[PDB]
Amino acid sequence: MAQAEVLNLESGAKQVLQETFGYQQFRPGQEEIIDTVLSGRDCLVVMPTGGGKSLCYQIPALLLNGLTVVVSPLISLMKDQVDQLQANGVAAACLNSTQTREQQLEVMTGCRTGQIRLLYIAPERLMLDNFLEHLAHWNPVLLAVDEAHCISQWGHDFRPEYAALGQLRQRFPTLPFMALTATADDTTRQDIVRLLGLNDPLIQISSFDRPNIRYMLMEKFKPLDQLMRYVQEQRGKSGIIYCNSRAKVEDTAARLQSKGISAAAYHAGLENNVRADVQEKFQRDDLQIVVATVAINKPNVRFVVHFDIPRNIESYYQETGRAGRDGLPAEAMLFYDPADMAWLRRCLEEKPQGQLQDIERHKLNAMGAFAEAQTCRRLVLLNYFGEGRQEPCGNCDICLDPPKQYDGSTDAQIALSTIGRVNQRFGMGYVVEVIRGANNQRIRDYGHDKLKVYGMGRDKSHEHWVSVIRQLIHLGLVTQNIAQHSALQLTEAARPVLRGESSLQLAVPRIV
Numbered sequence: 001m002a003q004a005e006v007l008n009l010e011s012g013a014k015q016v017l018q019e020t021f022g023y024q025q026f027r028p029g030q031e032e033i034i035d036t037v038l039s040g041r042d043c044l045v046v047m048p049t050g051g052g053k054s055l056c057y058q059i060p061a062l063l064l065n066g067l068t069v070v071v072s073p074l075i076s077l078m079k080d081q082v083d084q085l086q087a088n089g090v091a092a093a094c095l096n097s098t099q100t101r102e103q104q105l106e107v108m109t110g111c112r113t114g115q116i117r118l119l120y121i122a123p124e125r126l127m128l129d130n131f132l133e134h135l136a137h138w139n140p141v142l143l144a145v146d147e148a149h150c151i152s153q154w155g156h157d158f159r160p161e162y163a164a165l166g167q168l169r170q171r172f173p174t175l176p177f178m179a180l181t182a183t184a185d186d187t188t189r190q191d192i193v194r195l196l197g198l199n200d201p202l203i204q205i206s207s208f209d210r211p212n213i214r215y216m217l218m219e220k221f222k223p224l225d226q227l228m229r230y231v232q233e234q235r236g237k238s239g240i241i242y243c244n245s246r247a248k249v250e251d252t253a254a255r256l257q258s259k260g261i262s263a264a265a266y267h268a269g270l271e272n273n274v275r276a277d278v279q280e281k282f283q284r285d286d287l288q289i290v291v292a293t294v295a296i297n298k299p300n301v302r303f304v305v306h307f308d309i310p311r312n313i314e315s316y317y318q319e320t321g322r323a324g325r326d327g328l329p330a331e332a333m334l335f336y337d338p339a340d341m342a343w344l345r346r347c348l349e350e351k352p353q354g355q356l357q358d359i360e361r362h363k364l365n366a367m368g369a370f371a372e373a374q375t376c377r378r379l380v381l382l383n384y385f386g387e388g389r390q391e392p393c394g395n396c397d398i399c400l401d402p403p404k405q406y407d408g409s410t411d412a413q414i415a416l417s418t419i420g421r422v423n424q425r426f427g428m429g430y431v432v433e434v435i436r437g438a439n440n441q442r443i444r445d446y447g448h449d450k451l452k453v454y455g456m457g458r459d460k461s462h463e464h465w466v467s468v469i470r471q472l473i474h475l476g477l478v479t480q481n482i483a484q485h486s487a488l489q490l491t492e493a494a495r496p497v498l499r500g501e502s503s504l505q506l507a508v509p510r511i512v
């Protein structure tokens, strides 16, 4: 009926939480979003991996009168929210181009007459065949954009069909909007807001730390043996192993099977009833292990293995973010080889030059720098999302075996002072040439040869300077700007090192 369930909205949220979704307390972020959403103020909600984002629009939808529309690109999961929501008495529905015309009209007719409270619609469907015009007669009280980084060319998963979502604000000037995402760095967060035309929204950015996940890496070397010994050492704990090919999945699954490990294969070339069996056997812990391509929200996954490295940190974060959703101790292990990053680079550098290849090259490079990190793996991930932190976690493979340290105060001011001195406009190599005092026309053309930093670092190698700055980006003192061609930029945390007010310990850069 689209009828508000409670009389007092304030105490309504937590009423519903407990009485309708059975939970006991709100997860930080959650109340503030929900109260803001009931108030009618636009929002951008950035909740970490499996942090509880759907509740943020489901609870307000249950407490308001009218139709809440939820847009999502994940057809075949949207359907599965519908059914569980219907299970719990919640009057949900979805509407995509994958339905039959008869079935789409029936969902239109329940929105028309207010038998549907919550409507999950694919982006493409929402802008086609004058849907907005019909949507305007159904008392629409709230539009939620899920997966909202998908509208940005700067994120890791731009989808062209979300583009047209920038028309809705204009069409629906009193319609409150919320934009939800679990994966979007600063640029992308900023872009989401601009493109959807969020009106002075509350921007709530939860933390990205999952502290119960330990991040590890293993340098490949007879990797199949390494992958079998790794699994063995898990001593029965549940897991997902990610591979980039259907034959890697299929073959690994068979080898595990052959050693008495209850392991199955998952990928697109399985039949819809077979995937769902796989998923369900995994959900209940009938299977220890699922070997898969990039396609289950199980709360108790103990380990996530990446056999091949992802093309970006965003993907690496969502994929490892599947382990340990119950909050108990879990682990992510990435098997890496520097040749694997030379492949991807080769692959990428003969795709059509331009804007898109750049966005892709910056994101690959930052994935590549995480893998070759000499700094806490958790700090790399948080400072990549803009959650600037300098305290090592103590629960990742670099922190379990720290690299030899040296006082880097002098190295860091040199590097921090060059970046500021060149007006924060230049990428890593140019800066490093200025630090080393190369004989470069470009340098002479900009007069950087005249600077006092020019050549202060000549006695150390290009790789030394590369590591220093990479350690500064990993620690949150320096960002690489993706919208300015990866220009090295200074953050507030640089201030005390840059002033000489505080010392800084860095790893002695590795000889490679």
Ligand SMILES: Nc1ncnc2c1ncn2[C@@H]1O[C@H](COP(=O)(O)OP(=O)(O)OP(O)(O)=S)[C@@H](O)[C@@H]1O
Residues within 6 Å of the ligand: 023, 024, 025, 026, 027, 030, 047, 048, 049, 050, 051, 052, 053, 054, 055, 182
């Ligand atoms: N306050 C809460 N207390 C307990 N369980 C909760 C709470 N909020 C949500 N849940 C659960 O948290 C889980 C995931 O929340 P979702 O919204 O489905 O994940 P998400 O944060 O949106 O995930 P990603 O990053 O997109 S994968 C589900 O088990 C629940 O609905």
Ligand SMILES: [Mn+2]
Residues within 6 Å of the ligand: 010, 013, 031, 035
């Ligand atoms: Mn409240």
Ligand SMILES: [Mn+2]
Residues within 6 Å of the ligand: 053, 054
């Ligand atoms: Mn979600």
Ligand SMILES: [Zn+2]
Residues within 6 Å of the ligand: 376, 377, 378, 379, 392, 393, 394, 395, 396, 397, 398, 399
């Ligand atoms: Zn650490």
